[PDB]
């Protein structure tokens, strides 16, 4: 009843952003909406004038620094399926180092954000990638459990047919996992990106 | 799993109780959107106002207090510490299923799990102050 605010020009053109001045690093200013209203408080009714600036986060930094390291860690974990089952220390090194790399990535990913008490899309992606890496380690554990003898193929002897010195057979678990794990990870990536991008 | 009741106290700096007396109104402490605030790690349970008299060297002063009850939220810390520690413990359990003749593999697995625990302990304390008791 005492002071009322109005926009000088029409509301859309009453707020102007200089084209040269833009100090956003990880955001894109899509536009601005301009409006006015009232606020009711104990002291009385006050005119409020509002401008909502619409911002969209830029994904490139996080793609470079979180998603690609996680994807490469998953691929590195899945690489171990192509080694012979008798390379126990080597495959254990693969599994353990990939698990720790995923753990470190999970720890470092949340440092960017404020300490919010809910899971984000990046958190879900990291969780799925950790699940893949840990499942690969379990796969190696199963292969080692079913391994019989502790020496690999000599190089010259002729593996007779399962149907002298015997030798371990190539693991059916490894043969299946070699195609199963990359296919499932690719399907997960497809569904995840299709879910979260066009939103 | 901690909960706190943080105070906000005010009073007259100069004038003792015989000169200025404060009093709460009928509906004195009002709030708008409680859970649209900047409380990320905490949730606002409620508030309560009180009044008392505090004796100082200058005199007795009417002190007016508002306590805000805050309850911590488990999500961030569950992501950060609990899940990785349990996962590393399970990674340690994986050693039991490896052949005992795999000496370097099992030894590296165990010692590496103990390393990742030292590191997880070290980083779990970062958010807290340097208190001298176990949480």
């Amino acid at each position: 009843a005492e002071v009322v605010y109005e926009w000088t020009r029409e509301p859309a053109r009453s707020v102007v952003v200089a084209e040269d001045g833009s100090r956003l690093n990880q955001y894109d200013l899509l536009g601005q909406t301009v409006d006015s209203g009232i606020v009711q408080s104990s002291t009385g009714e006050y005119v409020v004038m509002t401008t909502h600036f619409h911002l969209k986060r830029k994904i490139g930094y996080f793609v470079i620094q979180t998603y690609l390291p996680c994807i490469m860690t998953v691929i590195l974990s899945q690489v171990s399926f192509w080694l012979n089952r008798e390379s126990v220390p080597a495959r254990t090194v693969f599994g353990v180092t990939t698990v720790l790399t995923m753990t470190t990535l999970s720890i470092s990913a949340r440092n960017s954000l404020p300490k919010v008490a809910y899971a984000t899309a990046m958190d879900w992606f990291i969780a799925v990638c950790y699940a893949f890496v840990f499942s690969a380690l379990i796969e190696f554990a199963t292969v080692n459990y079913f391994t019989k003898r502790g020496y690999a193929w000599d190089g010259k002897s002729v593996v007779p047919e399962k149907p002298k010195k015997t030798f371990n057979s190539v693991s059916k678990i490894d043969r299946l996992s070699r195609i199963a794990f990359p296919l499932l990870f690719g399907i997960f990536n497809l569904v995840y990106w299709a879910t979260y991008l066009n939103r | 799993m901690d909960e706190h009741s943080c105070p906000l106290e005010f009073s007259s700096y100069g004038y003792p109780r015989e000169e200025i007396v404060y009093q709460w109104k009928r509906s004195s402490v009002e709030v708008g959107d409680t859970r649209s605030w900047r409380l990320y790690q905490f949730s606002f349970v409620g508030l309560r106002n009180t009044t008392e008299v505090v004796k100082t060297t200058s005199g007795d002063y009417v002190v007016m207090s508002v306590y805000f009850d805050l309850s911590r939220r488990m999500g961030y810390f569950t992501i950060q510490t609990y899940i990785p520690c349990t996962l590393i413990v399970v990674l340690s359990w994986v050693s039991f299923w490896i052949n005992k003749d795999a000496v370097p593999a099992r030894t590296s697995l165990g010692i590496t799990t103990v390393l990742t625990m030292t590191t997880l302990s070290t980083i779990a304390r970062k958010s807290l102050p340097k208190v001298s008791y176990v949480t």
Partner: nanobody
Amino acid sequence: GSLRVSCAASGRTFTTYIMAWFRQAPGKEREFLAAMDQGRIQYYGDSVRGRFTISRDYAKNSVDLQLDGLRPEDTAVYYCAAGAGFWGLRTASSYHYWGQGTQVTVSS
């Protein structure tokens, strides 16, 4: 005539979302009547400025609309909406949650 339309939200905390009221008579596009923000700031359409009033109870997670000066041109279906106002706060597209809707009729 006077009337009151309430809209209570369950399953999600709509306190931190802008909550709005819309109207849609048959053969009409959903039009914005009112809205209220997290900061207790109220917006009204030009057709309904000064007649209808919007309020919110954040503890109960509800938005109420008191309709005054009802007229037979006002008969329509009234929708409750809530969401984050992105490119909107006056357009139905920006609200990601909607109610069933309630019919209102005035007879002279």
